[PDB]
Amino acid sequence: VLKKNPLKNLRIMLKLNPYAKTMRRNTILRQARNHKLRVERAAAALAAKSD
Amino acid sequence: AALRPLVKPKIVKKRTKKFIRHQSDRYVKIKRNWRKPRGIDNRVRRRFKGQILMPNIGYGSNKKTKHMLPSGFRKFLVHNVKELEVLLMCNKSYCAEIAHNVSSKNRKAIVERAAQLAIRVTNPNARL
Amino acid sequence: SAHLQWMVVRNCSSFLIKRNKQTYSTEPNNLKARNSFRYNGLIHRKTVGVEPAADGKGVVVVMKRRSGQRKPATSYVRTTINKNARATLSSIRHMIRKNKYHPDLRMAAIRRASAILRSQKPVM
Amino acid sequence: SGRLWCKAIFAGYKRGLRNQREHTALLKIEGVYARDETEFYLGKRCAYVYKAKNNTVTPGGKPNKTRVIWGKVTRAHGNSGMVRAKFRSNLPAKAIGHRIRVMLYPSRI
Amino acid sequence: NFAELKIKRLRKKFAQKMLRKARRKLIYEKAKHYHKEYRQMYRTEIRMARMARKAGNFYVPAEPKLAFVIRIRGINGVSPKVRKVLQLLRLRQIFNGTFVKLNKASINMLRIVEPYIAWGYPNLKSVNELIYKRGYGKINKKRIALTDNTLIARSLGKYNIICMEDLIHEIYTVGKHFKEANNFLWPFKLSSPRGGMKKKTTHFVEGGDAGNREDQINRLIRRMN
Amino acid sequence: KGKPHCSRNPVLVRGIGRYSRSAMYSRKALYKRKYAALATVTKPVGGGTRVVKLRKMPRYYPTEDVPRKLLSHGKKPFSQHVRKLRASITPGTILIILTGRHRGKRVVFLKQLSSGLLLVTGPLSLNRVPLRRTHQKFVIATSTKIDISGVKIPKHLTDAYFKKKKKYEITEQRKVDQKAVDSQILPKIKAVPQLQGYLRSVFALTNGVYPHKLVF
RNA sequence: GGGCCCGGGGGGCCACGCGUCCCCCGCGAGCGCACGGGGUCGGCGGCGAUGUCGGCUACCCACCCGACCCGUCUUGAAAC
RNA sequence: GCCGUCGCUGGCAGUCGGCAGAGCGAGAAAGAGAGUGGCGCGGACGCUACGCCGCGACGAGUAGGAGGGCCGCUGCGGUG
Ligand SMILES: [Mg+2]
Ligand SMILES: [Mg+2]
Ligand SMILES: [Mg+2]
Ligand SMILES: [Mg+2]
Ligand SMILES: [Mg+2]
Ligand SMILES: [Mg+2]
Ligand SMILES: [Mg+2]
Ligand SMILES: [Mg+2]
Ligand SMILES: [Mg+2]
Ligand SMILES: [Mg+2]
Ligand SMILES: [Mg+2]
Ligand SMILES: [Mg+2]
């Protein structure tokens, strides 16, 4: 069998570890939520600079 | 409409040049056939840089494309008409070849029988 | 028996031929014409052979009967099929398959009969 | 109605001090002498144009004496804007210090 | 008749299918419990370090039980005792790595081969790259790639190590059957370090790469692998 | 019997659902969707009725057959591939065609075709370039754009319209389509100052001008 | 912090059924998509019967790099 | 990727076909086992078992040793 790299390949990582599905489903939602919180903090800082 | 083989793979060759013998250029008594040098202080046999290469086992061709012609066939030497019923079955893989000592009146019969049996002859116009 | 005389025939037979890193057998009853145990016909009790006819048209099928094994004149029986292309191969397939007569060689006999038909077909 | 290829001078082969690997060619494209600037030419097609005695066929025209050896710019070399190329047929060393054509139509723009 | 037979074959196929699904559920929940354990172990060291600084004292962390050893020098011109220790640590070619647990025997076995090796204390993500990217097991004395968890579970199922996460948990949190897990793991055939080396011959303290580099081995594992 | 519904969860990462399997179970609502449990044709022949056979056994067998190949999983034909786009190539830009027989010509880009080639068309009075397909890689994309969104492109033209049939005479449909596209392009490019001369003039490299140095 | 984050008065979840007793507080089926046990196209363009296509090897020549004449006795040979 | 060596003394007699039901890559010492009461005649290759096929690692060499030569010369018994 051709050894596909689990660090690069997604489904080989899923075959070796089902919990990698939830590990990679998390830290997309978390990083997007933290990015939206960063945008909200920057908007509050710009509103404080304007006011 | 030449006789095509069944499968035509890419015949890769690791080396096409001849392994000429050491100091075959200098002397006329030395033939081009390879003999391994077995001296104490020779340059080729202990693999100095920029010398004559040696016939190792690593230069061997693939087993799928070994003893294979550039057309895609494997040679088989045929003496008479009776040896073409041997090759009527193995037609798309192996080919025929007429011997040098066969006369033209029998080469005509061999070429005619191989044309009936759809067998490719490497020398179809050997005497004429 | 079978393997007992195959261990004798396998290297030093008169039909054997070896050149160009190839090995064959020039037997009249050998089909696919190469040196093998399953394809050798002079040894086995049940032997199917496919040959061209004495005339230009037709294909003869040689069947080895089980009774006269030590009698070479009454061992083999020859039948001529001078029929069309599809029903000739169908007749040989019904000879080898449904009679329970050596079913390991039916497809090779069909290939050899197709080769003899391609040979006796007129050339382009 | 002008030049559609960048000027590049073939310096030499991929070589050590006492060995050369003639399958990889070293190319010196004019005008670029930095690793941050040689990132444009990565992947372009290049060819040594030369003319010979006998006529050879030409796609889209009459047969002429000109011949080429096509290739592909693989990756950068050094720090001074040198670059590598792998060709299908190896270059002759008659072409040492002569012009080849690197192209633009394998573009990434 | 072949009436009950095909139905019983379908029932056996369904039994193997639900058994496989139950084993997948077990592997998933073991990996989730392992993630919880790694979170707890990562936070508890920071907690112990914070409470000592709050009280005004100093927290000495526990010495790490596991090390990763890379044979950085070649085979030519080697002392016979040093070569014996290298072949007992399974370091045969250059740039091979092994996981070695620590004790008084292991520290002196690394001390006797310090100029020819580079050994350090690896990180969890470094163990993850070494096990996932270069996962080679010794099944029937053969270097077979670990592409499926059944290959691990066929050899180490009696030691409750049935998946890649079980193997990573054993190697990182060294426990009972670290010997069997490490002997299942083939010596990691690693590449040359990208970019370069500082110096191969001298020790890491005196401007080189040989010897002990505790936290600095994670820069070099990612450099080679 | 039921109408087909689209994918519930969005494409969060490629190959990764946005929700987990239990939240997907609750969205599918499978708690209340539970369940439990030719070759012969008879034909009259004027005798009796003969039973003919379809896909009958072959009359000819070759000397040797090849075995079947293994089943690859991700090897699509050319029609089923995904068709990529650059961020610079937008409908409205002016491209530079290089490798064709129209070398160095600055030609206006129209739209993306179905097969993957670029439908590029300049004015026949300006560029002398017809309704031509160009390859995406074989084109320099210059950031000089026009407001092309308010046009009525013909829908009958496609990748099969420009495929080579087999001297080549120009049909009247090509002339009608060229006029219909030119009448939509020409006022929008003549509204831009000095653009028609830029379309007529050819691109050419000269001394001291290098594509890694200049920007466009 | 650890105990399925012990227990009582907005977000994620490898949790899905019914009936009985005690303690604690083994077969449901159907259709596709595809980071899934090693490449395919169900994609194409040109040049060709009197001057061109292919021939790796072999005939000759040119260029770059390498490159001291074989056997021997010898610790050590290209050896003055 | 290809060649050879070594090891698994690994696998292949299972081509068991209207005298039929096409398997033993599967984490878990062992049976797709017998019983008795409550239309259409169809299915590629194989296996010179001194052969075929699959996995892994290995590959320098003087003196020297061993094996394979469908490498070569001459004569004899058979055979084509
Ligand atoms: Mg010496
Ligand atoms: Mg010119
Ligand atoms: Mg040394
Ligand atoms: Mg680098
Ligand atoms: Mg020199
Ligand atoms: Mg002497
Ligand atoms: Mg002496
Ligand atoms: Mg002396
Ligand atoms: Mg000497
Ligand atoms: Mg001297
Ligand atoms: Mg080696
Ligand atoms: Mg050796």
Short mmCIF file of C-alpha atoms in Angstrom, two decimals, chain B residues 8-126:
data_model
loop_
_atom_site.label_atom_id
_atom_site.label_comp_id
_atom_site.label_asym_id
_atom_site.label_seq_id
_atom_site.Cartn_x
_atom_site.Cartn_y
_atom_site.Cartn_z
CA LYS B 8 3.43 -1.94 -26.07
CA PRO B 9 5.19 -0.70 -22.92
CA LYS B 10 7.93 1.91 -22.83
CA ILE B 11 11.14 -0.09 -23.23
CA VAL B 12 13.50 1.77 -20.90
CA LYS B 13 17.21 0.97 -21.04
CA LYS B 14 19.63 1.98 -18.30
CA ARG B 15 22.63 1.90 -20.65
CA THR B 16 22.90 1.48 -24.42
CA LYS B 17 26.67 1.75 -24.93
CA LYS B 18 28.88 -1.32 -25.05
CA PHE B 19 31.06 -2.27 -22.09
CA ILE B 20 34.34 -2.17 -24.00
CA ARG B 21 37.42 -3.81 -22.49
CA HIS B 22 40.13 -1.75 -20.80
CA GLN B 23 42.92 -0.71 -23.22
CA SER B 24 40.98 -1.98 -26.23
CA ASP B 25 41.69 1.37 -27.90
CA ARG B 26 45.48 1.01 -27.73
CA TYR B 27 46.14 -2.56 -28.89
CA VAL B 28 44.69 -4.38 -31.88
CA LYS B 29 45.21 -7.74 -30.14
CA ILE B 30 42.74 -6.64 -27.45
CA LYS B 31 39.17 -7.27 -28.57
CA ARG B 32 36.11 -5.25 -27.60
CA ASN B 33 34.70 -8.15 -25.56
CA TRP B 34 34.65 -7.45 -21.83
CA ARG B 35 37.11 -9.21 -19.55
CA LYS B 36 37.24 -8.16 -15.89
CA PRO B 37 40.66 -6.68 -15.02
CA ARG B 38 42.16 -8.46 -12.02
CA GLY B 39 45.38 -6.54 -11.43
CA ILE B 40 46.87 -5.08 -8.27
CA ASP B 41 47.12 -1.42 -9.36
CA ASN B 42 44.56 -0.99 -12.12
CA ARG B 43 42.26 2.02 -12.42
CA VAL B 44 39.06 0.52 -13.86
CA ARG B 45 38.68 -2.41 -11.47
CA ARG B 46 38.68 -0.25 -8.32
CA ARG B 47 36.36 2.34 -9.89
CA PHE B 48 38.39 5.52 -10.31
CA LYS B 49 36.53 8.61 -11.47
CA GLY B 50 36.30 9.12 -15.22
CA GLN B 51 37.29 5.58 -16.23
CA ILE B 52 35.65 2.70 -18.09
CA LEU B 53 32.41 1.53 -16.48
CA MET B 54 32.04 -2.06 -15.30
CA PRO B 55 29.17 -4.49 -16.00
CA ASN B 56 27.43 -4.70 -12.63
CA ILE B 57 24.08 -6.34 -11.95
CA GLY B 58 22.48 -2.90 -11.59
CA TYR B 59 22.48 -2.34 -15.36
CA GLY B 60 19.91 -5.08 -15.93
CA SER B 61 16.79 -4.26 -17.90
CA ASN B 62 13.26 -4.81 -16.63
CA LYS B 63 11.87 -8.34 -16.79
CA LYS B 64 8.82 -7.13 -18.71
CA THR B 65 10.97 -5.61 -21.47
CA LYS B 66 13.91 -8.06 -21.48
CA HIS B 67 15.06 -9.67 -24.77
CA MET B 68 12.48 -7.42 -26.46
CA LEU B 69 12.78 -5.87 -29.92
CA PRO B 70 11.98 -2.16 -30.44
CA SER B 71 8.84 -3.29 -32.28
CA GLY B 72 7.64 -4.97 -29.08
CA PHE B 73 8.23 -8.61 -30.00
CA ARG B 74 10.57 -11.29 -28.67
CA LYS B 75 12.79 -13.14 -31.13
CA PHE B 76 12.61 -16.85 -31.92
CA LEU B 77 14.80 -18.54 -34.52
CA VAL B 78 12.85 -20.69 -36.99
CA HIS B 79 14.43 -23.24 -39.34
CA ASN B 80 11.50 -24.66 -41.32
CA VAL B 81 7.74 -24.60 -41.84
CA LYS B 82 7.12 -27.09 -39.01
CA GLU B 83 8.36 -24.62 -36.39
CA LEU B 84 5.63 -22.11 -37.32
CA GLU B 85 2.84 -24.29 -35.92
CA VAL B 86 4.67 -23.79 -32.62
CA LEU B 87 4.27 -20.01 -32.92
CA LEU B 88 0.77 -19.82 -34.46
CA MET B 89 -0.69 -19.72 -30.94
CA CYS B 90 1.80 -17.32 -29.33
CA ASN B 91 1.38 -14.75 -32.08
CA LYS B 92 0.76 -11.35 -30.47
CA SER B 93 3.63 -11.72 -27.98
CA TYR B 94 6.52 -13.51 -29.70
CA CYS B 95 7.75 -13.31 -33.31
CA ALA B 96 9.66 -15.53 -35.72
CA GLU B 97 13.08 -15.29 -37.36
CA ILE B 98 14.51 -17.32 -40.23
CA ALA B 99 17.99 -18.81 -39.89
CA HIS B 100 20.92 -17.73 -42.05
CA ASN B 101 21.62 -21.16 -43.54
CA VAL B 102 18.05 -21.60 -44.82
CA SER B 103 17.83 -21.48 -48.62
CA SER B 104 15.51 -19.10 -50.47
CA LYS B 105 13.12 -21.78 -51.75
CA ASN B 106 12.37 -22.70 -48.13
CA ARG B 107 12.39 -19.07 -46.93
CA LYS B 108 9.57 -18.42 -49.41
CA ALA B 109 7.52 -21.24 -47.85
CA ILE B 110 8.30 -19.99 -44.32
CA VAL B 111 7.24 -16.41 -45.20
CA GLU B 112 4.08 -17.68 -46.92
CA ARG B 113 3.12 -19.89 -43.95
CA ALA B 114 3.82 -17.06 -41.50
CA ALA B 115 1.69 -14.72 -43.62
CA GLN B 116 -1.10 -17.30 -43.40
CA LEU B 117 -0.60 -17.63 -39.63
CA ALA B 118 -0.30 -13.80 -39.20
CA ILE B 119 3.18 -14.13 -37.66
CA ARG B 120 5.60 -11.24 -38.13
CA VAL B 121 8.94 -12.21 -39.67
CA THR B 122 11.92 -10.02 -38.76
CA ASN B 123 13.46 -10.69 -42.21
CA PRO B 124 10.58 -11.11 -44.69
CA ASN B 125 12.79 -10.11 -47.66
CA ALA B 126 15.87 -12.13 -46.76
#
